[PDB]
Symmetry: C3
Subunit: 283 residues, 3 copies
């Protein structure tokens, strides 16, 4: 897909057009549509402005990067993403992450919506990602497929420690501060390609494999971030409880997902800000 | 792959060249090679005649759509299909289904051959598909991958109710009429890409995941049908019992599959006809 | 990808440029032994020389086929392979296997490195592959995908008997001779695409599915070999034990893998030679 130069050009373009120098990249999933509003000294770039950036044909906008400070933390926020189910190859899906690395970002925060597989979870819960199961990865759909560039990382990176232990500990503490009724969940996120929702039998399979939440994103980004050495922290908003029996007349649907994203908007906004304080300083 | 126009053209061609107006599409799998013979007022179209239709290089024929009445039921029958293992992309495999929708069909009946994973199953059994596990789908091989057309259906369709409850109830009753020794089985169908047959370890994996039968087709069609609102009903002829241990010297083989398809031909022909009576009338 | 001609040309080129006529092809695992040194009457071909052969951009060399005798057994050895994770399509990954068949080879020995999923395995163990779980295969990534050529094999080949039971029984049988403290393991190999290593959750998934060892190669080759009638035998050097819990601070890494491949080099070299004696005659 892209050459090392391509990534470098894209980073140079951004670096030369802003004085912001982000430590943390945040990929906004459902419910963080409005997180930019909490940025101070915001500066926007549209994907159409940025060289080599792929573009969503999705009607509203191409999407944007927004630099700024979140609780005095120097960050870049990514709004609008690319998904495997939309037809994008994985090197396009994960293009931004390699760019962030070249911006000198050292921490990636990924968020998403997911269906709850774990019976304890409730719509509205936040689940810290402790680990993932990369089903597309097993079959070949891994973003690192192809020639490896030692300037980014190793030919065979490890994923057993992908989700930073310390940030999860600190996240667990600091969540008490918000004084929420439901606690912070923690669990395994499984990635499926989508875009259709799971059958009952499929949900049962995912449960047996050990997954607590299922979604259609995030994992490829995590793998690329880890490949180039970034610290990674992630979580899912449980937006619906996956159907697990044939009796129910309920069905997963996207409007439900958006509604859940709205209810949780503030909780999520609050939580990401707080979390900024927990992030270690550069080096 | 195709544009909305393409589908529309193909449907218009067919609609303008026949007065038949099918309610039910039937995709014939093994053992239904001769089901066209029970059609009254038959009218054939070869795939070579039909605009935008993909074509099998398989030597005998391109294959054909045959309109007609089966037990006075207005239907179109599809003979010869396209498979993922043959190299076809999924939007080609499932092209006919979208066309059937545009013909005003509202019920899809899919049939196939499958290996028996459930120890209770016997060669010759018919298994009603209650649900499926779409393994290729997990990895990205989903026919709906790419831009969604809202003229067909939603961006994120649900599959939890894919196989019509009522049809299955009615099918279970009406099977008594044939007075068969072995009863109607019901279970989960798993799709694997093929074309090689499962190892023992793989068979055990598919059993653990909860599958009763394994095949190499059908699921992409079902997903597309449901996406555009069709009622779906399906079943598998158990043509062989998958090897489950290292002692056996038996091996799956395609001649065995064809033989089973032949033994069952009449039972199957009978069953599909009967079933026509059970189908609801056009809403 | 390739036509039947292409395969034939490549075979004709090789046949016409050597008098060696191998019975056994051996694919030396990426991470494993430089066993060519034990070949007598060696004759090398570089991949660059051979028509239609794909080529590794990997800096050191394209890689080579080396004909010869190993314990008086007429064989061809393949050093350097192609992997799905490198971007190669499967028909390129398995191209050599089809060519071996056309050379008149009738037995394929495949070896590789693998991470240990079964708690009983120890770094250094050899695991005979009794069976495999082809995960990419389930999703479409099967090397036989596309039109079938009946000149090679059936449209729907069976894999339930892929790994020759006699060769395994003999291997385990004569292993006594390998006067090792530790014995010959036997198990299920699972293929995953790679190139990144498994998480803990994935490890547990693969364990539940019944796999004993996990790797990123071999299976496509085996599928192609069996499609054209070859006898297949295969084994894995357990080069590391896959991380199974969140507490550990160990991580899989490729240097560990190369180290283990080094410690085991002689044990492996010895074992393959011995095995030559066990192979049936044409
Ligand atoms: N695959 C999948 N993704 C989701 N994202 C939000 N809910 C769901 C779900 O139920 N399934
Ligand atoms: N994968 C698969 N497909 C089939 N079609 C008919 N029998 C079988 C079988 O045993 N396995
Ligand atoms: N996937 C995989 N392949 C390997 N080859 C050697 N070790 C490993 C491992 O731990 N995982």
């Amino acid at each position: 897909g892209y050459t090392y130069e391509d990534y470098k050009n894209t980073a140079e373009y951004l670096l030369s057009h802003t004085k912001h120098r982000p430590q943390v990249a945040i990929i906004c999933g459902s419910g963080l549509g409005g997180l930019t509003d909490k940025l101070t000294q915001a500066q926007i770039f549209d994907y159409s402005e940025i060289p080599n950036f792929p573009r969503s044909t999705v009607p509203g906008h191409a999407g944007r990067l927004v630099f700024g400070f979140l609780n005095g933390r120097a960050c870049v926020m990514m709004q609008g993403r690319f998904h495997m189910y939309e037809g994008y190859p994985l090197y396009k899906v994960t293009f931004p992450v390699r760019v962030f690395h070249l911006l000198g970002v050292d921490t990636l925060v990924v968020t998403n919506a997911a269906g709850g597989l774990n019976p304890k979870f409730e719509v509205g819960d936040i689940m810290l990602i402790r680990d993932h199961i990369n089903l597309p990865g097993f079959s070949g759909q891994n973003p690192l497929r192809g020639p490896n560039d030692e300037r980014f990382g190793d030919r065979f990176p490890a994923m057993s420690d992908a989700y930073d232990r310390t940030m999860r500990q600190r996240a667990l503490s600091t969540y008490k501060q918000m004084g929420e009724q439901r606690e912070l969940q923690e669990g395994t996120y499984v990635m499926v390609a989508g875009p259709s929702f799971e059958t009952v039998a499929e949900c049962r399979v995912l449960q047996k494999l050990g997954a607590d939440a299922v979604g259609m994103s995030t994992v490829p980004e995590v793998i690329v971030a880890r490949h180039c050495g970034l610290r990674v922290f992630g979580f899912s908003l449980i937006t619906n409880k996956v159907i697990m029996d044939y009796e129910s007349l309920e069905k997963a649907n996207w409007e439900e997902v958006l509604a859940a994203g709205k209810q949780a908007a503030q909780k999520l906004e609050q939580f990401v800000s707080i979390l900024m304080a927990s992030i270690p300083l550069p080096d």
